[PDB]
Design a protein around this ligand. Structure first.
Ligand SMILES: *[C@@H]1O[C@H](CO)[C@@H](O)[C@H](O)[C@H]1NC(C)=O
Length: 44
């Protein structure tokens, strides 16, 4: 459980917030994300 996605439509044309949680630091980012259908991070 490595972060969250907040928004209103979870799409473009309106903004949304993204909390991702790396091994050293959290990066909160509030941009017009074109969110995918099944969002996941991808580690080696
Ligand atoms: C997480 O992000 C920071 C900066 O955004 C970066 O310095 C760090 O290396 C990243 N973590 C990993 C495991 O790559």
């Amino acid at each position: 459980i490595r972060g969250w996605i907040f928004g209103t439509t979870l799409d473009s044309k309106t903004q949304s917030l993204l909390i991702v949680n790396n091994a050293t630091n959290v990066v909160i980012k509030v941009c017009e994300f074109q969110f995918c259908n099944d969002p996941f991070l991808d580690v080696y």
